[PDB]
Amino acid sequence: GPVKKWECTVESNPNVATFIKELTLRLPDGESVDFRAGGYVQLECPPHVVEYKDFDIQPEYRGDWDKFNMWRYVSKVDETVIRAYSMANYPEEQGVVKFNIRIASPPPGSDLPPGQMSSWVFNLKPGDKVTVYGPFGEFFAKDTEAEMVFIGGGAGMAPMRSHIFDQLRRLKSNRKISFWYGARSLREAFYTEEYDQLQAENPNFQWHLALSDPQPEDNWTGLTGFIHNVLFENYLKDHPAPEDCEFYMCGPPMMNAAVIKMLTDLGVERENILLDDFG
Ligand SMILES: Cc1cc2nc3c(=O)[nH]c(=O)nc-3n(C[C@H](O)[C@H](O)[C@H](O)COP(=O)(O)OP(=O)(O)OC[C@H]3O[C@@H](n4cnc5c(N)ncnc54)[C@H](O)[C@@H]3O)c2cc1C
Ligand SMILES: N#Cc1ccc(Cn2cnc3ccccc32)cc1
Ligand SMILES: [Mg+2]
């Protein structure tokens, strides 16, 4: 049916990585969003001014905000803006919509305006009101028996979480499913307890965190490098039939491109690769 509108309330908005927040919105009582995993809603902001020094950023992430001179940015938005954000919750988690949102600050050293909506999102405090429209979606799972390979980075975590819980918790799928998540260092990884629990509950599920720049404090001995190299060397190189898998990708643009080239070089058909392009 037609687009629905909900006036929601912010429940929480912590950082989950240096430049990503988990925004949770409480729908007005007695309402829920009838969405499909991989789908999204539109958030709206009114005209405003936000100053980055007003943000609540958890302590461990502040040093990089200082390093990147983030606190001096100011965003002036003179008209209502609408932007799409993917649901991080899966359809059964009701009463809320949860998001993973990256702050799109100006290219460093440029004089460009800060990202309009994401700068506003980063100043949202518990109790603030946010208008939401939807549901929408097209990044949906195929209904087959094929092995699934989920590949995420950055705020592309959100549809990955929605997809993976939807398969394992609602569809109770016995399909072979793996999730490969690329991040710079341990500080940028999140939902690790959730995926570890899903792996311990479902023998058909396996997840892999790969760090491209592990920090000294990480003492990292896990998978290391960029996710396309890691996924190839640790799983797809020896796979008997990678072209029989369904690949679901959502990351930053450079990651999307590198993973796609890797896959097609392997002989995977672009029709077996589904990309959520945040744009
Ligand atoms: C279906 C869909 C789902 C999405 N899901 C998510 C999600 O789950 N999480 C998420 O974080 N994002 C998601 N996105 C992206 C999101 O909708 C926004 O595009 C993103 O948040 C940036 O919007 P913004 O208004 O903050 O920045 P914008 O105002 O659109 O600015 C974007 C960037 O451009 C820079 N810029 C400004 N002016 C210029 C200029 N003249 N030249 C060059 N650069 C300039 C800004 O400083 C900023 O870095 C999704 C998008 C789609 C379409
Ligand atoms: N948002 C975000 C985000 C940005 C970079 C990385 C590091 N990373 C890992 N694999 C990569 C492939 C190509 C390019 C970068 C890559 C991870 C997440
Ligand atoms: Mg306020």
Author numbering: 128 to 406
Authors' account:
Here, the development of the Fast Fragment and Compound Screening (FFCS) platform, an integrated next-generation pipeline for crystal soaking, handling and data collection which allows crystallography-based screening of protein crystals against hundreds of fragments and compounds, at the Swiss Light Source is reported. One of the first academic collaboration FFCS projects was performed on protein crystals of two homologous bacterial enzymes. The two crystal systems relied on different precipitants, PEG and high salt, and both crystal systems had to be adapted by a distinct post-crystallization treatment to cope with the addition of large amounts of DMSO in the soaking procedure (Stegmann, Sharpe et al., in preparation).
For both projects, the 500 most diverse fragments (selected based on the structure descriptor FragFP) and 50 project-specific fragments were selected from one of the FFCS pipeline fragment libraries (Maybridge Library Ro3, Thermo Fisher).
